Write a protein that binds this ligand. Structure first.
Ligand SMILES: NC(=O)c1ccc[n+]([C@@H]2O[C@H](COP(=O)([O-])OP(=O)(O)OC[C@H]3O[C@@H](n4cnc5c(N)ncnc54)[C@H](O)[C@@H]3O)[C@@H](O)[C@H]2O)c1
Ligand SMILES: NC(=O)c1ccc[n+]([C@@H]2O[C@H](COP(=O)([O-])OP(=O)(O)OC[C@H]3O[C@@H](n4cnc5c(N)ncnc54)[C@H](O)[C@@H]3O)[C@@H](O)[C@H]2O)c1
Ligand SMILES: O=c1ccn([C@@H]2O[C@H](COP(=O)(O)OP(=O)(O)O[C@H]3O[C@H](CO)[C@@H](O)[C@H](O)[C@H]3O)[C@@H](O)[C@H]2O)c(=O)[nH]1
Ligand SMILES: O=c1ccn([C@@H]2O[C@H](COP(=O)(O)OP(=O)(O)O[C@H]3O[C@H](CO)[C@@H](O)[C@H](O)[C@H]3O)[C@@H](O)[C@H]2O)c(=O)[nH]1
Ligand SMILES: [Cl-]
Ligand SMILES: [Cl-]
Ligand SMILES: [Cl-]
Ligand SMILES: [Cl-]
Ligand SMILES: [Mg+2]
Lengths: 347, 345
């Protein structure tokens, strides 16, 4: 059978997706450069070594940068891929605005190169990791796929938007390409085993890991970025979606490609928004601990509220986000508790 | 530090700009991969060999591709540049729609690689070849720099808008950078000598060269892409600008970078629009030849009318186009008549 190439497969979403793929009968080939993934004691990234244990299935992996043309070409020559799931890229530690060229090089040129290599090797089926950030500051809610895109605040979001645009044109020009662009909302939670999860390096830039870190006792209090937004409690509102559900949406995307779907774009969210305080409260409930916090200044570029309109995906992808808030918090807690300091090499 | 790097300098606008640079006292270093330039009998592209003869000044040239990181590194180590004028890229031969990846690779990846090397070497002064196509279908006319941009119809135009956006971001992130983004309208004409000019290969996609080719007798008749637009005569209207004035605008941009201006954007147009038929007529006058034409269907994605609001460039850049229609046509004809097969065969 033909393989599925997973770029950035050792990361948060990627590792969860590799797990889903293995369970569903697929044969992935994963690549990662360790830019934001922990190396295990062996060749495999720790996250994937664990996915191998969890599934009882082998993970084919190669350490490689998507920017390395020769390595990528050799890879496409060695295997017969039927599709590519592209997670590799830079996300922001609120860094993008300051290092635009890094985002443009890694995300933009990296993806252009991948598309070129794909085309040359006759692989024209892609699943791309997009984001709700491409919608920019919401002009209305909930955010449906028809909401305007572009006009993003930072280089990270613009990079995502430019990539979407490029893929849309590619599909427009060549009807033989099939591409599913998945606009993720705010992924959270972890695999139910508690063995893998989000493994941030240093001080977490995103909410959830910070909250869990407070709950576990690593951090004293959560810093709440502004409480004067035009939301019910004044704190930011987001559509948190269980990483497992998100991962499963990728399998749905592969099925969609098989229908010779052309270019399709789908939001991957729950359709339900929760504020910062609400997430804190849910974490107190999951963890059985009080979670202190302090209100500080707004974070540059933060939007008031963002949540998806998930109907298109339910309809066309035949997918829905099955896990609720308590599940997300309980799963995140299990991962946090079982792995107080994230991933580590085997003892 | 001292020299000015000119990418794609062997092309139409680039060669004319190289000439202007030389006459103004600058020292250019030109790079080109010959993707759309004719090779002379020697090292230099024919256009540049001619520029050298016309100015009596030497042209420093290096055959290379902007997509080659290794060559860029060597180049930046070899010379000390104070600024870069970036013309290299793929234009559409109405091709963009059908070959997106080529456009994105050359225009996007090539520009990003260039920006990275510039940054690495501390050469944070750029002049970029943008286009009025970034405005998309005009919402109002004339087009001023404040008109909305983006939401372009093609991979080519999209590529231009994406590049502008990247540059804006870069300037935001690093206040030391200076960048002048030049939105050209419809470049036409040629150097007064008649020795250099646009050298299209095959059937021209743009109006003027097609028109001149009909006049010289290379083409039977001009196909007019629709005569039912909401223009005074039903045919498409454009702001034709003489390539010599356009080239001079680049020198004004260079001076602007010296002010430590950050990111600035200017239209490079005359502010006067002319229809397909007006251009044909003016060409008949200039050439003394008849230019038969046939009205055909509208061309995919064509806009009815597009022309610039040249105020900002006059005010801030201190520049205005001086040459008019008759001069553009006179110069275009001279080039075509004197060089029936372009630079060579
Ligand atoms: N986490 C979110 O909330 C979120 C929301 C929006 C969209 N996304 C996108 O989904 C994707 C996955 O996000 P994530 O949370 O799992 O991030 P992550 O950082 O954990 O995963 C990305 C993986 O890519 C790898 N990588 C980075 N640069 C690479 C390169 N040049 N070559 C090869 N591998 C490289 C990293 O080492 C990492 O393992 C990213 O493209 C991200 O932009 C994530
Ligand atoms: N002519 C127009 O109507 C028009 C309109 C607006 C903007 N522009 C832009 O202005 C610039 C110059 O246009 P032009 O009419 O002179 O076109 P041109 O094709 O004559 O000049 C571009 C030059 O770049 C060179 N080149 C292409 N790819 C290269 C690469 N990878 N590395 C090095 N050199 C490379 C080509 O060989 C050519 O000599 C381009 O960026 C074009 O998109 C032109
Ligand atoms: O220490 C923190 C972190 C976050 N927040 C707030 O919590 C909310 C969520 O913030 P964060 O987790 O950083 O999420 P977002 O900025 O919404 O971005 C996440 O989700 C986006 C999709 O909506 C993706 O594009 C991003 O990559 C991803 O990190 C916002 O209201 C933040 O202001 C705090 O108050 N304190
Ligand atoms: O054989 C031809 C060629 C052109 N036209 C018409 O002539 C006009 C000019 O056409 P063309 O020379 O192809 O220019 P544009 O369609 O305006 O596109 C140009 O103008 C933009 C700025 O306005 C630049 O950015 C582009 O790169 C440049 O190709 C239009 O109304 C065309 O419909 C014809 O009728 N027949
Ligand atoms: Cl291992
Ligand atoms: Cl020579
Ligand atoms: Cl030098
Ligand atoms: Cl292509
Ligand atoms: Mg719906």
């Amino acid at each position: 059978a033909e393989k599925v190439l997973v770029t950035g497969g050792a990361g948060y979403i990627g590792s969860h997706t590799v797990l889903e793929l293995l369970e569903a009968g697929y044969l992935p080939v994963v690549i990662d450069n360790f830019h934001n993934a922990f190396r295990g004691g062996g060749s495999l990234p720790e996250s994937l070594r664990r996915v191998q244990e969890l599934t009882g299935r082998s993970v084919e992996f190669e350490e490689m940068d998507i920017l390395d043309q020769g390595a990528l070409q050799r890879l496409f020559k060695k295997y017969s891929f039927m599709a590519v799931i592209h997670f590799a890229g830079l996300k922001a530690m609120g860094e993008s605005v300051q290092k635009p060229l890094d985002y443009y090089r890694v995300n933009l040129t990296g993806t252009i190169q991948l598309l070129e290599i794909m085309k040359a090797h006759g692989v024209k089926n892609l699943v791309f990791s997009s984001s709700a950030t491409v919608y920019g500051n919401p002009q209305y809610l909930p955010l449906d796929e028809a909401h305007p895109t572009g006009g993003c605040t930072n280089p990270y979001g613009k990079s995502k938007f430019f990539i979407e645009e490029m893929i849309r044109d590619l599909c427009q020009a060549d009807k033989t390409w099939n591409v599913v662009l998945l606009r993720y909302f705010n992924p959270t939670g972890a695999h139910a085993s508690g063995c893998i999860g989000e493994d941030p390096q240093g001080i977490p830039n995103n909410l959830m890991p910070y909250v869990s870190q407070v709950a576990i006792g690593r951090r004293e209090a959560l810093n709440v970025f502004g409480n004067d937004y035009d939301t019910e409690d004044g704190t930011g509102v987001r559509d948190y979606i269980h990483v497992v559900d998100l991962a499963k949406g990728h399998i749905a995307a592969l099925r969609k490609l098989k229908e010779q779907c052309g270019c399709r774009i789908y939001n991957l969210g729950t359709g339900t928004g929760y504020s910062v305080l609400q997430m804190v409260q849910a974490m107190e409930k999951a963890s059985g601990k009080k979670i202190p916090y302090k209100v500080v200044a707004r974070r540059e570029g933060d939007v008031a509220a963002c949540y998806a309109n998930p109907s298109l995906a339910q309809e066309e992808l035949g997918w829905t986000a099955a896990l609720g808030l308590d599940r997300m918090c309980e799963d995140l807690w299990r991962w946090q508790k079982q792995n107080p300091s994230g991933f580590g090499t085997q003892a």
